[PDB]
């Protein structure tokens, strides 16, 4: 299953990748990665780069993706904040020159803006770009991640989507950013690397 990556943790710091990739899912997805927009991101950065030079993981441990969790102020639990921390500290020990590119879904673009909003200027100088689909803290944060360079922040915000908009609906919906990731994200990753 695509569903669960470890490769950061599996890493070994000689043989490190061109890029790292880091993604948190969304509410309710299974594994590390998820079933939607996480898999989709990292297909793309290994039909890009090689699956040699890409180093995908997702943000498991403590970060369980449950919908409780959305309606704490920073939209997640802290475990999951520095759970994603903590996998960004270890891509810089192990390899601090590969370009670390990130991305997150939902409650899992709290996690990415979370964790790298508190992040040392060593590390967020090594995240390269990050990609958040549907960021539930648009309203509240303004479509960009604190702390962290909009240059390298690419937020998708469909219309549609309620969690854009300064709240939270929960109920079974379609998810909205299949061409986003597929095609836009890819691409603005891949002008960022590196």
Not at 3 to 19: D, F, I, M
């Amino acid at each position: 299953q695509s569903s669960t990556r470890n490769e950061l943790e599996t890493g070994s710091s000689s043989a490190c990748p061109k890029v790292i990739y880091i993604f948190a899912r969304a509410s309710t997805e299974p594994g590390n990665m998820g079933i939607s927009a996480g898999p989709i991101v990292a297909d793309a950065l290994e039909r890009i780069y090689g699956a040699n030079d890409v180093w995908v993981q997702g943000v498991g441990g403590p970060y369980l993706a449950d919908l409780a969790s959305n309606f704490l102020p920073d939209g997640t639990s802290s475990a999951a904040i520095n759970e994603a921390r903590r996998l960004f500290t270890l891509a810089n020990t192990k390899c601090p020159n590969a370009a670390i590119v990130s991305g997150g879904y939902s409650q899992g673009t709290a996690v990415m803006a979370g964790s790298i909003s508190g992040l040392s200027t060593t590390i967020k100088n090594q995240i390269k770009g990050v990609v958040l689909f549907g960021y539930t803290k648009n309203l509240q944060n303004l479509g960009r991640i604190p702390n962290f360079e909009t240059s390298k922040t690419e937020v998708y915000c469909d219309i549609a989507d309620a969690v854009c908009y300064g709240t939270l609906f929960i109920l079974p919906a379609h998810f909205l950013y299949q061409t986003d990731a597929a095609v836009a994200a890819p691409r603005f990753l891949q002008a960022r690397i590196g």
